[PDB]
Amino acid sequence: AQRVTFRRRNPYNTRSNKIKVVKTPGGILRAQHVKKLATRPKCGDCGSALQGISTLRPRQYATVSKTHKTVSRAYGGSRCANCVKERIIRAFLIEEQKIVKKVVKEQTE
Amino acid sequence: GKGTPSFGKRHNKSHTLCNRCGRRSFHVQKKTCSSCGYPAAKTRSYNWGAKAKRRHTTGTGRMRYLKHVSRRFKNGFQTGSASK
Amino acid sequence: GRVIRNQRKGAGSIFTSHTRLRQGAAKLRTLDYAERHGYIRGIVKQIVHDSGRGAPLAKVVFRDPYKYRLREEIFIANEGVHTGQFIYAGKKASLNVGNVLPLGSVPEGTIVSNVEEKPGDRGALARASGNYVIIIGHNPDENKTRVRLPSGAKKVISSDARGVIGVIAGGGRVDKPLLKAGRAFHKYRLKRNSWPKTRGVAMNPVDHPHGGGNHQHIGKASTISRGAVSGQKAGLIAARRTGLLRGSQKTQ
Amino acid sequence: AAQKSFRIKQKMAKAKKQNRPLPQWIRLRTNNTIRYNAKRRNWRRTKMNI
RNA sequence: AUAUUGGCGAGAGACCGAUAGCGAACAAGUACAGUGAUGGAAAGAUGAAAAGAACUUUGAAAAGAGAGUGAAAAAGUACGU
RNA sequence: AUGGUGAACUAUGCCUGAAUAGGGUGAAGCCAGAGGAAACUCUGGUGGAGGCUCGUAGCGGUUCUGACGUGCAAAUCGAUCGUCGAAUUUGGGUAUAGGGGCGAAAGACUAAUCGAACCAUCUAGUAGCUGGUUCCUGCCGAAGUUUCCCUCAGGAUAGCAG
RNA sequence: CGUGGAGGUCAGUGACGAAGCCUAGACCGUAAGGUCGGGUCGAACGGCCUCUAGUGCAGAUCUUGGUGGUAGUAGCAAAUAUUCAAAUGAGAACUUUGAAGACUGAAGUGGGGAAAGGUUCCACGUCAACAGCAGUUGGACGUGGGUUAGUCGAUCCUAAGAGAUGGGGAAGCUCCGUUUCAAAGGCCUGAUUUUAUGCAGGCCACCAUCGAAAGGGAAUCCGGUUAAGAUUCCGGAACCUGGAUAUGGAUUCUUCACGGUAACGUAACUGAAUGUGGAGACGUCGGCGCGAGCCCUGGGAGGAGUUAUCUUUUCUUCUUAACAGCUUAUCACCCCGGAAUUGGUUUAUCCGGAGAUGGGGUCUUAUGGCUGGAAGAGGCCAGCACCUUUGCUGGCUCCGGUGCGCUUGUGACGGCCCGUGAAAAUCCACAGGAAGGAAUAGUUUUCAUGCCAGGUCGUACUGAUAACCGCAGCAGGUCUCCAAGGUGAACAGCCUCUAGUUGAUAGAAUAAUGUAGAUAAGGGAAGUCGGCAAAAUAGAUCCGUAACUUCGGGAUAAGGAUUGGCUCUAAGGGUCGACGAUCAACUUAGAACUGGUACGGACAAGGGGAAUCUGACUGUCUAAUUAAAACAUAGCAUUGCGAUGGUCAGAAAGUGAUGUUGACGCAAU
RNA sequence: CUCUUAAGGUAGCCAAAUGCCUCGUCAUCUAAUUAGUGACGCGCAUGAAUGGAUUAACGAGAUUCCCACUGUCCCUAUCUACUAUCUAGCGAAACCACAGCCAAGGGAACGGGCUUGGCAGAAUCAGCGGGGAAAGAAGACCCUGUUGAGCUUGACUCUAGU
RNA sequence: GCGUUGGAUUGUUCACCCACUAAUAGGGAACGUGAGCUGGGUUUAGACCGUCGUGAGACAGGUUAGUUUUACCCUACUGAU
RNA sequence: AAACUUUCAACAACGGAUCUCUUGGUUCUCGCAUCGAUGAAGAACGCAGCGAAAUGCGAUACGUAAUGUGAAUUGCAGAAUUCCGUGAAUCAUCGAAUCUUUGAACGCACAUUGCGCCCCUUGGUAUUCCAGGGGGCAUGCCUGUUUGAGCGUCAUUU
Ligand SMILES: [K+]
Ligand SMILES: [K+]
Ligand SMILES: [K+]
Ligand SMILES: [K+]
Ligand SMILES: [K+]
Ligand SMILES: [Mg+2]
Ligand SMILES: [Mg+2]
Ligand SMILES: [Mg+2]
Ligand SMILES: [Mg+2]
Ligand SMILES: [Mg+2]
Ligand SMILES: [Mg+2]
Ligand SMILES: [Mg+2]
Ligand SMILES: [Mg+2]
Ligand SMILES: [Mg+2]
Ligand SMILES: [Mg+2]
Ligand SMILES: [Mg+2]
Ligand SMILES: [Mg+2]
Ligand SMILES: [Mg+2]
Ligand SMILES: [Mg+2]
Ligand SMILES: [Mg+2]
Ligand SMILES: [Mg+2]
Ligand SMILES: [Mg+2]
Ligand SMILES: [Mg+2]
Ligand SMILES: [Mg+2]
Ligand SMILES: [Mg+2]
Ligand SMILES: [Mg+2]
Ligand SMILES: [Mg+2]
Ligand SMILES: [Mg+2]
Ligand SMILES: [Mg+2]
Ligand SMILES: [Mg+2]
Ligand SMILES: [Mg+2]
Ligand SMILES: [Mg+2]
Ligand SMILES: [Mg+2]
Ligand SMILES: [Mg+2]
Ligand SMILES: [Mg+2]
Ligand SMILES: [Mg+2]
Ligand SMILES: [Mg+2]
Ligand SMILES: [Mg+2]
Ligand SMILES: [Mg+2]
Ligand SMILES: [Mg+2]
Ligand SMILES: [Mg+2]
Ligand SMILES: [Mg+2]
Ligand SMILES: [Mg+2]
Ligand SMILES: [Mg+2]
Ligand SMILES: [Mg+2]
Ligand SMILES: [Mg+2]
Ligand SMILES: [Mg+2]
Ligand SMILES: [Mg+2]
Ligand SMILES: [Mg+2]
Ligand SMILES: [Mg+2]
Ligand SMILES: [Mg+2]
Ligand SMILES: [Mg+2]
Ligand SMILES: [Mg+2]
Ligand SMILES: [Mg+2]
Ligand SMILES: [Mg+2]
Ligand SMILES: [Mg+2]
Ligand SMILES: [Mg+2]
Ligand SMILES: [Mg+2]
Ligand SMILES: [Mg+2]
Ligand SMILES: [Mg+2]
Ligand SMILES: [Mg+2]
Ligand SMILES: [Mg+2]
Ligand SMILES: [Mg+2]
Ligand SMILES: [Mg+2]
Ligand SMILES: [Mg+2]
Ligand SMILES: [Mg+2]
Ligand SMILES: [Mg+2]
Ligand SMILES: [Mg+2]
Ligand SMILES: [Mg+2]
Ligand SMILES: [Mg+2]
Ligand SMILES: [Mg+2]
Ligand SMILES: [Mg+2]
Ligand SMILES: [Mg+2]
Ligand SMILES: [Mg+2]
Ligand SMILES: [Mg+2]
Ligand SMILES: [Mg+2]
Ligand SMILES: [Mg+2]
Ligand SMILES: [Mg+2]
Ligand SMILES: [Mg+2]
Ligand SMILES: [Mg+2]
Ligand SMILES: [Mg+2]
Ligand SMILES: [Mg+2]
Ligand SMILES: [Mg+2]
Ligand SMILES: [Mg+2]
Ligand SMILES: [Mg+2]
Ligand SMILES: [Mg+2]
Ligand SMILES: [Mg+2]
Ligand SMILES: [Mg+2]
Ligand SMILES: [Mg+2]
Ligand SMILES: [Mg+2]
Ligand SMILES: [Mg+2]
Ligand SMILES: [Mg+2]
Ligand SMILES: [Mg+2]
Ligand SMILES: [Mg+2]
Ligand SMILES: [Mg+2]
Ligand SMILES: [Mg+2]
Ligand SMILES: [Mg+2]
Ligand SMILES: [Mg+2]
Ligand SMILES: [Mg+2]
Ligand SMILES: [Mg+2]
Ligand SMILES: [Mg+2]
Ligand SMILES: [Zn+2]
Ligand SMILES: [Zn+2]
């Protein structure tokens, strides 16, 4: 079987030196250096992967349109749908409870 | 070990070229030349090292400017021209 | 005629703490106007392991009263503290586990942790896992609070010094035998180069006061005077007594 | 090392340019006490030591 | 007025005459050794002048034998004796 | 003794990387079944734990007290060995420097140097001790004994000699 | 007596030959020595009277240099191995070519790299020296050629750490300290536009810098090309950053979009300060799933081999990059619904009224598929022609299958910790609404297209039984990537394919003694300090397994049987619609037959038992004579200390380690 | 009973890696045992975290016995490869007062030389390990030196720190 | 003149016992014999114990581990020209 | 008797002693005072027609300018001989310049031929981006200038 060599001067099997063995149109086997895989962006509230947001290396996000990096909702590509809904419910209920607490304080005096 | 087998492990330079003296005495990790004392302002020298002082003293180079001071003094540090 | 190991430790060349993986210094909030006069509410976001420390740390996020931003603080998590819990810190905060209170504002018998030795020092006493300080009484005139420390010592502290209600989490840790030199190795790998320990009696005389002799033996009393000098203080320094302890502790 | 600093490459270039025998028209000069290149260096005999 | 193993410019010696005299009379603090601080040599002389041996011959060649130059080749750069 | 140079070897800590076939054994957790009045007990699977184990690559170096011992080699060669998935091995970066470091501790290691490295100077250090001490001839020609000495391998002193 | 030098003198000697040197030639002196003759030689030197000293050598394991006997001696013996012919050449065991025989046997003697070296790379000429034989050859000698980058690295970031400044210490060289007891700052813009500036509205800093060619990181691939360069050159095809930009597209009369219940979708679809979040960004092991490459294999289209005989046969080509469009997952999420007769479900038992199963959807694009790139490339062939450049002209480059396979990537999980397994640069998103925005018209360089530029340094080669270190062309040491077939559990050993090498001074004999490898009748440790050495055992399947025990082990205890080949049999599955069709791979068990009773047939591969001393165990050390009972270890115990502290550093400090610490801790035993 | 101490060695264990006598005594193991094991203990001089006793498992630790096994031996023999050997080429080093036949004598008390005898014939090759009191190193043991150094201690004299 | 042994234990010289035998005599040769071997002991450095010492350390006290180098020269000897 | 060994002589070797040389060293005496932020000493890298070094020099590179002398330099090549001339020379002298990268070393760094900021100017529409050219940006301290801070503090308005 044909054997391959690193294409860069790094001879060590480090995280940044991963290679794949591909066959070229010349009919031979050659190493191709593969970038480290991207990590899905994660919700800032619960930590789950954010649905609908592309998974790219940090600087690749500068080369894609806004549609790839956000979701049409109140917190886009920052918080997940369930965490946004929980934020809505908490905000509304706590403001209502603030109103009732204020009136209770006013009517207990 | 500690002899021929251990001499095979010598592939990391403790010293590199010194910018000031060029002697390959610049300690890589101390960032100091063991010969001329760079980057200290003064040039390293010791009175017990008389041979080293004689190796590095004035006159061991080409004295690009100092070599003409004696002639200029002999001519009185004149400033004009010979005036044919 | 050689510098001994406990003398060499003071230079801090290979004997410094391995602090790379540590979460940061565990401190109470800076004693500010909010804590001095009322209370401030923060939120426990994470309970995280700290390398080299038995007790877990709690990341508590507060609001900055003077600028619009969040201030994350690293408390030592008390047992029962959970993520999403509201922590209240100040003179007017309630007597609940995880709350930070002045020692004078708590009743006698209260169990606190991360107790300040001086007000504003952000926590000095009862910080190790499972450790705690007992409030035993207050001296409202010249305001001072008497406390019992984990060592059993009675201390008089300013009543403005703060502590966290409860016991430090991670208790019972030293009850489990390490069972392995490897487990001791991994324990001290993230604290400091203090392990393993060669016995001084197994060394040569040049290396240690206990070294030498045709049998391994100290040769002279291992109890060393407090007034001895560096290189002599090996063994039991300024020992009041020796031998197996029998009877009751807490001399008075 | 095939990844060398410019300073090292410059010293290498100077050594390459001065790695030559004595010019043959020397040894014809009037007095010419010079017989051969006494400072000749070879990679197999004496290392440059940077 | 005193000092001056450094620097510059001079004049000298009952000193040494290339294993001596400075380490270095010479491309000497050079070549070279050591990671480094440092350590550190050896090495002068053909002849007045290259006139450094045209040419022939043997040999693959180096060279040899001649021839020749030179006061001398019992001076042939492996060079005063 | 003074002032300097070294952690390219090695010792140790740290930082960042990398490397470690194939088998044996078969711990928790889980599933099914059986026995029992109960308390509980048992069986078959599954699973894949351990500073477990056989054993490569590796790391080390037990024995032959083998080879060699003017060597391939100022420590190697062959067989036989210990160990081989964590107190593991290792690259690079970094820190600790001489009465100092570092040491799972042998006075070990700290560049073939260690019960105090290397380099230069003080230094031509001192030596009652060892070795040597360069031409001829002529004349005279001893002593190993007295006394004293931190003296007994030395000196002073008297004696012998010129 | 003799030597170097000095004053005087002999108007001394000398190119018609001074000094020196050689001379079983002569003379004188007892001698130190002196004199003469001869040869060699070429420029100075001597007698006497005195002066002076670095003034006389056989030694000092004396110093420097040179030279012997040993001695043509020891030896040039590890790494399986060389042979024939031709060419070249003066000369060939060693160069070249061809043929043959071999080896490394993918954990290589292969192909690349890191450190290091520095031209060893390549060509031509060439052999005085080196290559411990040789040499026509070479990593040699001489002369030249060669290293081409926006995309690969450095450069940038920070790590352990190093280190100015402000300050403090020190006689001082300098030391501490790295945000500290400091008045440490420029980028946004109203107004200033007597000038977009200083004044002056209004917002932000607990801080230099260095530190990785394996950590983080913007972006490049394929084919071809050289004697030597290639992700760099050439051709083609892309991408990123910075900048400038004009169209188209989009948006706006409801100014800053619409659709979907929703998860969310899109070609766009304003968004300052400030704040928040994410990515960067992370351990190790185990099983399982999937992908890629490799391996194996069927049909077919070509070429090559064998063909006394057999073989629809053996070998070989049949390939598709970065990038782009469409599409494609596990996981996760959303809508309907309310579930016990509990259901779903993994190899591994987790999940469900905090909403399971089920039905229908959404999403991440690792990855795979099709297409473009792109067949025009590359590969394999055929038919012609050839003074050159060699020129062409055609054809085929297709369709599958299989898996506890190997390597690797990845996913969802599970085990483990008193171990929970970096940081920063950088990028993006979100909250917010400052501000600026339309109607004989405004907005939008996160949509498409279009324009320009991307500097500097490195790039050759070796990377080792000859390019590094070890005095050297040294059997030593030196980090890492890829990794075929068989046998076999296997990256073991053995054989082979691709690739590479055939390099170790040779020839002739076959004494002793050796080094290495072996065998041996009968006995079986009687040898020896001692079973040292060697032998015996060994794999797998089945049976069987004691004392003791911390119940985990001991244990492969001990002790037994079998194993080949061949022909069969049985069991264990997938897909499609109790069965039928079809497809597919090994593992186990059994039987018969068979043979010089052989069969883990080479390779590979435990000796076992009964006890005593000792250390619990795993582990560690005297590198280069000691590996152990020594050290360490977990366990146990003691001691000090509550910070104005314990222990320990520093010459001192407004200094430091523990300490990013606080008695379940640190420190000393 | 005394003398006597701070206490007088307790639980354990032992001719033990600790017992002089000592190869202790008894038993077992063997034909035979200074070995091994099990016992005994007035134990020169066992003993309790200077840890005592015992311990499954583990061990390139030390030791005894048994089975198997074998050239360890009886008692040696044979074979292979590479040397050694010879040749072509290449070509060191150690060492060397001068050198090299003995016996006795005497002698610095063990001679190659001296004395007296024996004897004694060129030039050599392969082996060999008696001798050259062979070589390698100014003995490391011992002693001396009014020579050091590492280490220790209420040696003398000081000193950082406190 | 000729022979004077095989073994258990011990590093042993010595000793003792078993056994065969004709006998199991005593000794020397640098207490023959380490460039002949071996290295069990003694007698470097590691380590344990007992006693002693305040200690470093001491112990003809015990125990365990611990590199045995070179001949090619001369002679002698063995053979060979 | 040869060979071999030894001694001597001649010639030839090995080796470099002796002798004679000496642009060197060493010592003594005399005279003088002159390094550097106007960038020293030292270092690196380059420069000649043909040079590896020594020596000299710095991209104006074995050197330019100026002065003096008056015909060379030399190993070869080249040039010239007008050389009765502002003119050879590897001459001497030396007052004008150049003086790469550095170095006390000075924008920040430096195991990097790494990374900025400001002014003028040029090109690419170009105040902003990229590039070329020229000139600058260290620290401590002194005098002065300007702009400031402090209820430290005076006067005035109040
Ligand atoms: K989206
Ligand atoms: K002791
Ligand atoms: K191994
Ligand atoms: K010593
Ligand atoms: K002179
Ligand atoms: Mg050493
Ligand atoms: Mg270093
Ligand atoms: Mg401990
Ligand atoms: Mg210990
Ligand atoms: Mg010890
Ligand atoms: Mg001491
Ligand atoms: Mg003491
Ligand atoms: Mg000991
Ligand atoms: Mg001289
Ligand atoms: Mg001469
Ligand atoms: Mg003559
Ligand atoms: Mg000669
Ligand atoms: Mg290192
Ligand atoms: Mg094992
Ligand atoms: Mg070995
Ligand atoms: Mg041996
Ligand atoms: Mg030998
Ligand atoms: Mg010792
Ligand atoms: Mg003297
Ligand atoms: Mg007389
Ligand atoms: Mg006296
Ligand atoms: Mg004497
Ligand atoms: Mg003289
Ligand atoms: Mg004469
Ligand atoms: Mg003579
Ligand atoms: Mg003459
Ligand atoms: Mg003299
Ligand atoms: Mg002499
Ligand atoms: Mg003499
Ligand atoms: Mg001598
Ligand atoms: Mg000599
Ligand atoms: Mg020979
Ligand atoms: Mg040999
Ligand atoms: Mg061989
Ligand atoms: Mg050959
Ligand atoms: Mg060939
Ligand atoms: Mg093989
Ligand atoms: Mg093979
Ligand atoms: Mg080549
Ligand atoms: Mg040769
Ligand atoms: Mg030759
Ligand atoms: Mg060449
Ligand atoms: Mg890149
Ligand atoms: Mg500093
Ligand atoms: Mg940096
Ligand atoms: Mg990287
Ligand atoms: Mg190439
Ligand atoms: Mg291109
Ligand atoms: Mg739209
Ligand atoms: Mg569902
Ligand atoms: Mg993809
Ligand atoms: Mg791998
Ligand atoms: Mg390359
Ligand atoms: Mg290469
Ligand atoms: Mg390679
Ligand atoms: Mg080398
Ligand atoms: Mg198989
Ligand atoms: Mg037999
Ligand atoms: Mg038999
Ligand atoms: Mg038997
Ligand atoms: Mg026996
Ligand atoms: Mg015997
Ligand atoms: Mg015995
Ligand atoms: Mg054995
Ligand atoms: Mg068995
Ligand atoms: Mg057993
Ligand atoms: Mg052990
Ligand atoms: Mg293990
Ligand atoms: Mg050793
Ligand atoms: Mg050993
Ligand atoms: Mg121990
Ligand atoms: Mg008792
Ligand atoms: Mg006893
Ligand atoms: Mg006993
Ligand atoms: Mg026995
Ligand atoms: Mg005891
Ligand atoms: Mg072990
Ligand atoms: Mg005799
Ligand atoms: Mg006698
Ligand atoms: Mg003799
Ligand atoms: Mg006689
Ligand atoms: Mg011999
Ligand atoms: Mg002998
Ligand atoms: Mg002596
Ligand atoms: Mg001595
Ligand atoms: Mg005396
Ligand atoms: Mg002393
Ligand atoms: Mg004897
Ligand atoms: Mg002998
Ligand atoms: Mg011997
Ligand atoms: Mg003996
Ligand atoms: Mg022994
Ligand atoms: Mg010993
Ligand atoms: Mg005692
Ligand atoms: Mg003794
Ligand atoms: Mg300059
Ligand atoms: Zn969320
Ligand atoms: Zn320097």
Within a 10 A sphere around the Cβ of A61, how many other Cβ atoms?
16
**C to B contact (≥3 Cβ pairs closer than 8 Å):** no
**What span, in angstroms and rounded, lies between the C-alpha atoms of B43 and B53?**
10
Residue type, position D16, single letter: K
**What span, in angstroms and rounded, lies between the C-alpha atoms of B72 and C84?**
86
Closest CA to C29 of C16, C10, C42, C15: C42
Closest CA to C120 of C145, C100, C105: C100
Question: What residues in chain B have their Cβ under 8 A from chain D's Cβ atoms?
Answer: 13, 16-17, 24
Structure tokens at C115: 């107790």
Range C90-123 burial, b when 16+ CB lie within 10 A, else e: bbebeeebbbbbbbbbbeeebbbbbbbeebeebb
Q: Which residues surround ligand 12, an ion (CB under 5 A)?
A: C 209, 220
Residue type, position B63, single letter: M
**What span, in angstroms and rounded, lies between the C-alpha atoms of C207 and C131?**
37
Please state the length of chain C: 252
**What span, in angstroms and rounded, lies between the C-alpha atoms of C178 and C135?**
33
Technique used by the depositors: cryo-EM
Which residues of chain B neighbour D11 with C-beta distances below 8 Å?
17
Chains in contact with A via at least 3 Cβ–Cβ pairs below 8 Å: none
SS3 category, B71: helix
**What span, in angstroms and rounded, lies between the C-alpha atoms of A96 and C194?**
59
Could you write out the DSSP letters of every residue in C18-74?
Answer: --TT------PPP--HHHHHSEEEEEEEEEE--TT-SSPEEEEEEE-SSSSSEEEEE
Please answer whether residues C79 and C169 qualify as being in contact, where contact means their C-beta atoms are separated by less than 8 angstroms. yes
Q: What is the resolution of this structure in A?
A: 2.0
Looking up tokens 């009751």 gives C248
Max distance between CA atoms of chain A, in angstroms, equals 91
Q: How much distance in Å is there from the Cα of A64 to the middle of ligand 55?
A: 34
Flag if B17 and D7 touch (Cβ within 8 Å). yes
Burial of C75 (0-12, 13-18, 19+ CB in 10 A): buried
Q: Using H for helix, E for strand and C for coil, what is the string for B20-67?
A: CCCCCCEECCCCEECCCCCCCCCCCCCCCCHHHHHHHCCCCCCCCCHH
DSSP structural state of residue D21: P
Please answer whether residues C119 and C158 qualify as being in contact, where contact means their C-beta atoms are separated by less than 8 angstroms. yes
Q: Please, which residues 27-46 of chain D have a Cβ atom closer than 8 Å to chain B?
A: none
DSSP structural state of residue C127: -
Phi, psi angles (nearest 5°) of residue C86:
-85, 125
Structure tokens at C36: 């001095």
Closest CA to C218 of C238, C199, C243: C199
Torsion of CA C57, C63, C67, C69, to 10 degrees: 70
Q: Note the CA–C1' distance, C95 to G228, in angstroms.
A: 84
Please answer whether residues A4 and A30 qualify as being in contact, where contact means their C-beta atoms are separated by less than 8 angstroms. yes
Phi, psi angles (nearest 5°) of residue B34:
-75, -10
Looking up tokens 């810190």 gives C89
Closest CA to A31 of A43, A39, A22, A42: A22
Residue type, position C195, single letter: W
Beta strand spans in chain C (E):
39-48, 57-63, 70-76, 86-90, 100-102, 111-113, 133-139, 144-148, 154-158, 162-165, 223-224, 236-237
SS3 category, C173: helix
Please answer whether residues C19 and C40 qualify as being in contact, where contact means their C-beta atoms are separated by less than 8 angstroms. no
Torsion of CA C170, C172, C178, C179, to 10 degrees: -140
Closest CA to C100 of C150, C31, C158, C151: C31
Q: Using H for helix, E for strand and C for coil, what is the string for chain A?
A: CCCCCCCCCCCCCCCCCCEEEEECCCCCEEEEECCCCCCCCECCCCCCECCCCCCCCHHHHHHCCHHHHCCCCCCCCCCCHHHHHHHHHHHHHHHHHHHHHHHHHHHCC
